[PDB]
RNA sequence: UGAAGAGUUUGAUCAUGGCUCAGAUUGAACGCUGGCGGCAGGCCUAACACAUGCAAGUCGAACGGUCCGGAAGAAGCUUUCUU
């Protein structure tokens, strides 16, 4: 079924009237591998509590990437905040060439081959958001045709 | 068919920005150590001063003499001497 991948976890600390209260954040990527992706980022007083809470959120917000022969339909450049992500389809045998943030989201996405690169801000939280956004704008000739 | 970044200026955050890191290479040197073989390679620093040896000849099918060698003569032998 759905497979989860732990993108990254941060300690995250903040000053409050009384001392320091620690809350852990966690990026999780849920995907079956046949076209469905899911990003989740939830916090919690405990690491595992955040991880699980994250997975639940990831499964609540999924996207149906229109995969084509282990690749995508066309290159896309999504720009979230200061972060920027680019994607480019590639023939088979190239492999998923991209950062851990994007790759993990692409692997579960079912993507078998793709050429990508991170631009601007390298923030892992902003890049994953940019990646998913790009996976949404993805359109196929069928959609475009039926769209026009 | 071709592009992963990370650490550090905050109490914490974002941005700007400088510095820094794992790799590969070098007709190298230095330290500890060191068995064999093949191929390759060796003043990268003063035109500073230099002992000693060595770094171009070849032709007598161009011509007259010495040095080295062979052969034949005048002689009984030797010396000497001739071609």
From Swiss-Prot:
Part of the 30S ribosomal subunit. Contacts proteins uS4 and uS8. With proteins uS4 and uS5 encircles the mRNA as it enters the ribosome, which may play a role in mRNA helicase processivity. Can be cross-linked to mRNA. In collided ribosomes contacts ribosome rescue factor SmrB. It comes from Escherichia coli (strain K12). PANTHER family: MITOCHONDRIAL RIBOSOMAL PROTEIN S5. The N-terminal domain interacts with the head of the 30S subunit; the C-terminal domain interacts with the body and contacts protein uS4. The interaction surface between uS4 and uS5 is involved in control of translational fidelity. It comes from the Bacteria. Coiled coil: none annotated. GO terms for cellular component: cytoplasm; cytosol; cytosolic small ribosomal subunit. Keywords: Acetylation, Antibiotic resistance, Ribonucleoprotein, Ribosomal protein, RNA-binding, rRNA-binding. The gene is rpsE. With uS4 and uS12 plays an important role in translational accuracy. Many suppressors of streptomycin-dependent mutants of protein uS12 are found in this protein, some but not all of which decrease translational accuracy (ram, ribosomal ambiguity mutations). This is Small ribosomal subunit protein uS5. PROSITE patterns: RIBOSOMAL_S5, S5_DSRBD. Changing residue 13 to P: In strain: SPCR13 and SPCR15; spectinomycin resistant. Not a ram mutation. GO terms for molecular function: rRNA binding; structural constituent of ribosome. Changing residue 11 to L: In strain: SPCR9; spectinomycin resistant. Not a ram mutation. InterPro entries: Ribosomal_Su5_D2-typ_SF, Ribosomal_uS5, Ribosomal_uS5_bac-type, Ribosomal_uS5_C, Ribosomal_uS5_N, Ribosomal_uS5_N_CS, Ribsml_uS5_D2-typ_fold_subgr. The keyword Transport does not apply. Altered uS5 proteins have been identified in a number of mutants. Some mutations in uS5 have been shown to increase translational error frequencies. Some mutants in this protein can partially suppress an alanyl-tRNA synthetase mutant. Belongs to the universal ribosomal protein uS5 family. Residues 2-65 form the S5 DRBM domain.
């Amino acid at each position: 079924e759905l497979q989860e991948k732990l993108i990254a976890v941060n300690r995250v600390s903040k000053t409050v009237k009384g001392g320091r209260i620690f809350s852990f954040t966690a990026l999780t990527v849920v995907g079956d591998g046949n076209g469905r992706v899911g990003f989740g980022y939830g916090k919690a007083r405990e690491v595992p509590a955040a991880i699980q809470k994250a997975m639940e959120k990831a499964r609540r917000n999924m996207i149906n990437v229109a995969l084509n022969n282990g690749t995508l339909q066309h290159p896309v450049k999504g720009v979230h905040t200061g972060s920027r992500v680019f994607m480019q389809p590639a023939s088979e045998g190239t492999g998923i060439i991209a950062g851990g943030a994007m790759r993990a989201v692409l692997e579960v996405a079912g993507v078998h081959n793709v050429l990508a690169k991170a631009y601007g801000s390298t923030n892992p939280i902003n890049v994953v958001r940019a990646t998913i956004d790009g996976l949404e704008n993805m359109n196929s000739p069928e959609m475009v045709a039926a769209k026009r």
